[PDB]
Enzyme design. Structure first.
Site, PDB file in Angstrom:
ATOM      1  N   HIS A 237       0.504  -0.791   0.123  1.00 31.88           N
ATOM      2  CA  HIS A 237       0.383  -0.281   0.273  1.00 31.88           C
ATOM      3  C   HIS A 237       1.109   1.231   0.034  1.00 31.88           C
ATOM      4  O   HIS A 237       0.711   2.329   0.026  1.00 31.88           O
ATOM      5  CB  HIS A 237      -0.888   0.008   1.214  1.00 31.88           C
ATOM      6  CG  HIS A 237      -0.610   0.458   2.539  1.00 31.88           C
ATOM      7  ND1 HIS A 237      -0.355  -0.957   3.396  1.00 31.88           N
ATOM      8  CD2 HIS A 237      -0.336   1.235   3.147  1.00 31.88           C
ATOM      9  CE1 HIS A 237       0.608   0.036   4.732  1.00 31.88           C
ATOM     10  NE2 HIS A 237       0.265   1.441   3.819  1.00 31.88           N
TER      11      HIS A 237
ATOM     12  N   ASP B 221       0.077  -7.630   1.471  1.00 30.67           N
ATOM     13  CA  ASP B 221       0.188  -6.067   1.946  1.00 30.67           C
ATOM     14  C   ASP B 221       1.468  -6.355   2.095  1.00 30.67           C
ATOM     15  O   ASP B 221       1.885  -5.973   2.502  1.00 30.67           O
ATOM     16  CB  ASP B 221      -0.035  -5.357   2.915  1.00 30.67           C
ATOM     17  CG  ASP B 221       0.080  -3.719   2.585  1.00 30.67           C
ATOM     18  OD1 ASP B 221       0.902  -3.774   1.813  1.00 30.67           O
ATOM     19  OD2 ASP B 221      -0.247  -3.367   4.039  1.00 30.67           O
TER      20      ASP B 221
ATOM     21  N   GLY C 257       3.133   6.266   8.700  1.00 29.69           N
ATOM     22  CA  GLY C 257       4.674   6.784   8.759  1.00 29.69           C
ATOM     23  C   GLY C 257       5.902   5.506   8.926  1.00 29.69           C
ATOM     24  O   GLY C 257       7.132   5.618   8.201  1.00 29.69           O
TER      25      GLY C 257
ATOM     26  N   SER D 275       4.580   2.159   8.429  1.00 22.14           N
ATOM     27  CA  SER D 275       4.409   1.419   7.027  1.00 22.14           C
ATOM     28  C   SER D 275       5.357   1.078   6.365  1.00 22.14           C
ATOM     29  O   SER D 275       5.953   2.005   5.837  1.00 22.14           O
ATOM     30  CB  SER D 275       3.085   1.631   5.864  1.00 22.14           C
ATOM     31  OG  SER D 275       1.790   1.946   7.018  1.00 22.14           O
ATOM     32  N   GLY D 276       5.168  -0.298   6.246  1.00 26.64           N
ATOM     33  CA  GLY D 276       7.123  -1.379   5.821  1.00 26.64           C
ATOM     34  C   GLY D 276       7.719  -1.508   6.025  1.00 26.64           C
ATOM     35  O   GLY D 276       8.325  -2.153   5.319  1.00 26.64           O
TER      36      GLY D 276
END
Ligand SMILES: *[C@](=O)([C]([C][C][C][C][N])[N]C(=O)O[C][C])C1=NOC([C]C2=[C][C]=C(C(=O)[N][C]3[C]C4=C([C]3)[C]=[C][C]=[C]4)[C]=[C]2)=N1
Ligand SMILES: *[C@](=O)([C]([C][C][C][C][N])[N]C(=O)O[C][C])C1=NOC([C]C2=[C][C]=C(C(=O)[N][C]3[C]C4=C([C]3)[C]=[C][C]=[C]4)[C]=[C]2)=N1
Ligand SMILES: *[C@](=O)([C]([C][C][C][C][N])[N]C(=O)O[C][C])C1=NOC([C]C2=[C][C]=C(C(=O)[N][C]3[C]C4=C([C]3)[C]=[C][C]=[C]4)[C]=[C]2)=N1
Ligand SMILES: *[C@](=O)([C]([C][C][C][C][N])[N]C(=O)O[C][C])C1=NOC([C]C2=[C][C]=C(C(=O)[N][C]3[C]C4=C([C]3)[C]=[C][C]=[C]4)[C]=[C]2)=N1
Lengths: 243, 243, 243, 243
Positions: C44, C91, C192, C194-195
């Site tokens: 995402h 994801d 922030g 994320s990933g």
């Protein structure tokens, strides 16, 4: 700062940043070290209303804001009594540090101009700070200290320009006598540089000619930046800061 | 308006709303009809820089903003020439409508005071408009015209209060002589009411004593709302508006 | 990162930061170096819609964001084809760098877990990143990489919690099998992060058990952080990233 | 609503506005009256997390939002158990009012479609609401109810379009079977319209074909609006709403 570029770390050893307590000590205005224990800035940065000193701190020369902070507490905030708004005038103030700072080649005081100094046009002056790089455009991280060379223009030339495209009567003074102007549509100070210094190399020495005060926007046509004229308030300053 | 209430339909038939062009004719300031073809407002609402008349419209008394719009075009904007900023003074301006308005019981002019009228401190006066209901607190839909009774205060007292908690020398005038002042920590005009009227009932006739001008916040301690004293500028108004 | 602490400079050598072109190269997501030329991140963060590679950059381990930037271009974005939204699943994505990175003790790859590793509920794992310090509360400058020890919780247990205070049927899966979860009301990852990685030390070896994916707010009651289970997509990762 | 116009006062007598308690009862979603005591809306407007009923009110057909409010309290909020996020599906919910509304020519229920209706491409349908008139731009005051004719398109044709310019694999379904799509780059529903109705006149009678659910932006290329398909959830509805 609009235009110009990131300043070398060996320059503007007197530049300082003012911080207000919040989620973190955020920079709201510039300032300059004029004496090991005193900082000169704009009155609208700290007044006209009385502030809680506990919520205020000073940061000496930094190449990048917030990255190498060593906040210094303040014991006194002295605002010129003739001040109420920047447009009216006397936009000048003093901050007395809680301890003297150890000066060095990387951090020291800026020299004040003699009462006679007038800073004629064609005068190579510079303005510095961590303010916006344009109208409604923040200095992006890592927040480098910027510098820009700005042309000094006569007070009467600026007053006239400010009346262009304005309803204000031509004889109603806008750019006042205790003020000084500089900058154009490509070089100018902006929101965030306030209280900061405007310096000019005269006879091979740097003198602080002004304090970033106000303007109608930044680098806008017929609206050069306005600064408090330091020579006009020398007597007031020297009433607090030792000669 | 702070601390007021919605105004009944039959009251304040002179209140008008100023609209600027954008995604919709948005209200930016208030005003008052003082003659079939003239609107009195605050200079800072339309100056100091010259505005494009095509982007401006006037809306007569509306119980709820935007709902029954009948926008009227403006033919001329006359901003007092001595104006530059609200704090400096002369914050008054005239708007000449393209056509004269058809007066009625619901919409008609307000009476200007005579040059000698001296609204003494304590006199119950009212201020109206669609401005914020509190500092940074916008007026919620459906945007009813609000009203609030505010007590007038002696010029010198207001000026004095503005010095409390301030660095400004006590001898430096903040609330100037061409300004009038009313309100307290519970009743006051606010952002969006600017240019609107402050009227008082004298000898059975409503007279406009002031024009909402400026203030430090809205309804703040020792910070009464400042208004432009109309009596001070009657001669200027009559240079344009038929008696 | 919620409820964490600034990470020591010698920790998390694989943490990376993804930048997107604009007024400056702004961080929008984290990621992990899993191979000299490959960065593992959340789909995402770069999908489902195709993105222009020229507007994307990777920044290897930085103690303070934006401070010592040395942006690295990306040669390819590989988003799992089954991905559409974080709540649906899959994801996860891969970033191939144009040049292989030169590892060191300060900047080197994280180890992927073996297909059988399970990460028992209660296994001290850590999540790192420059995301918010709380719901709608950004990480204040100088932007230090943060870290926090979060307790892993059983898949069914998290799925159950998300149903508490929800209309969703108890038999309808919210936290799915290709997801993992961890954290509590005091410790969590946030917008922030994320990933970014969720690592656990298994027998003296750090394995990336998860990739920050989504959650209902941050550190909210009965709403533990949801991560993409890496073990679930090893085969997909290995189809691109060599052993 | 994007690309439509103000709706005549006599149309869409079933349109409803949902209000949440705040500084004023603000509109957050639309709905429809499908029974004297029931409103049909989208599940994401009120879920997946349980809400405090007190903070919710319903407003019946109104030409202008907030103008003639007569807020009705809600006794029950029923959200489809299969719902969690709009993209996943089952984006439908029911609101039972505390009392029956008295129907009339200006305010009555909409007719639900027979289980066997597919609503073919072409046949004119309309979508109504008080949502944004384009991406990121709100409906300007006085907030008139807007309407717009949207062309319906087969599910599989929209599913493909959603895959254009995206990483999602062609066989991974985006527009699901319990969904229906309509609109183009010039006609669509937008934020604020959710929960609202999509009605089609079929055989001289209006039937609610769907509920405004989601979309990638509004009126964007290859991204037609997606609606919950009503015929799919008829049995569920009739589990609560009579005949
Ligand atoms: C200035 O940068 C600009 C100058 C523009 C140059 C044009 N070439 N001046 C300006 O805007 O003037 C208007 C009259 C500037 N930027 O922002 C300001 C005004 C300002 C002053 C102070 C604060 C602030 O946050 N103050 C804090 C500090 C403190 C507080 C409040 C409470 C307690 C302790 C300390 C914000 C904005 N001028
Ligand atoms: C006033 O409501 C307040 C009064 C507070 C009372 C406290 N007791 N005064 C104030 O803020 O003074 C500061 C000096 C007010 N609200 O907003 C303003 C300032 C302002 C003026 C004008 C605009 C504006 O949008 N003007 C338009 C008109 C026009 C434009 C710009 C372009 C082209 C044609 C016409 C915004 C804000 N004062
Ligand atoms: C994540 O930080 C959060 C994680 C929360 C953990 C809870 N414990 N996840 C989240 O919000 O998920 C909801 C599904 C996060 N923060 O912000 C996002 C979403 C996001 C994705 C992508 C961008 C972005 O700017 N992308 C760029 C990349 C790129 C672009 C756009 C254009 C051209 C080239 C490259 C911003 C925000 N997830
Ligand atoms: C919808 O208008 C759009 C539809 C887009 C159509 C494109 N052709 N959908 C959307 O944006 O979906 C995102 C997945 C819409 N607009 O805003 C929303 C989301 C939303 C839901 C709910 C609220 C809200 O404020 N809820 C209140 C109600 C209530 C609360 C919170 C607490 C207690 C009691 C009652 C806001 C926004 N969808």
């Amino acid at each position: 700062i609009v235009g110009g570029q990131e300043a070398p770390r060996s320059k503007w050893p007197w530049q300082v940043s003012l911080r207000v307590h919040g989620p973190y000590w955020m920079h709201f205005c510039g300032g300059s070290l004029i004496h090991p224990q005193w900082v000169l800035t704009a009155a609208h940065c700290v007044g006209p209303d009385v502030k809680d000193l506990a919520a205020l701190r000073v940061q000496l020369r930094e190449q990048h804001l917030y990255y190498q902070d060593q906040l210094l507490p303040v014991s006194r905030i002295i605002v010129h009594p003739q001040f109420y708004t920047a447009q009216i005038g006397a936009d000048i103030a003093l901050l007395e540090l809680e301890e003297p700072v150890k000066v060095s080649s990387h951090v020291h005081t800026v020299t004040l101009p003699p009462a006679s100094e007038t800073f004629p046009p064609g005068m190579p002056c510079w303005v510095t700070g961590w303010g916006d790089v344009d109208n409604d455009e923040r200095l992006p991280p890592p927040f480098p200290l910027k510098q820009v060379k700005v042309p000094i223009m006569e007070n009467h030339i600026c007053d006239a320009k400010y009346h262009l495209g304005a309803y204000t009567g031509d004889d109603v003074r806008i750019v006042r006598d205790d003020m000084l102007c500089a900058g154009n549509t490509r070089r100018d100070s902006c929101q965030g540089d306030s209280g900061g210094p405007l310096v000019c190399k005269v006879n091979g020495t740097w003198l602080q000619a002004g304090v970033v005060s106000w303007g109608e926007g930044c680098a806008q046509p017929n609206r050069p930046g306005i600064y408090t004229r330091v020579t006009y308030y020398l007597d007031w300053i020297h009433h607090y800061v030792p000669k």
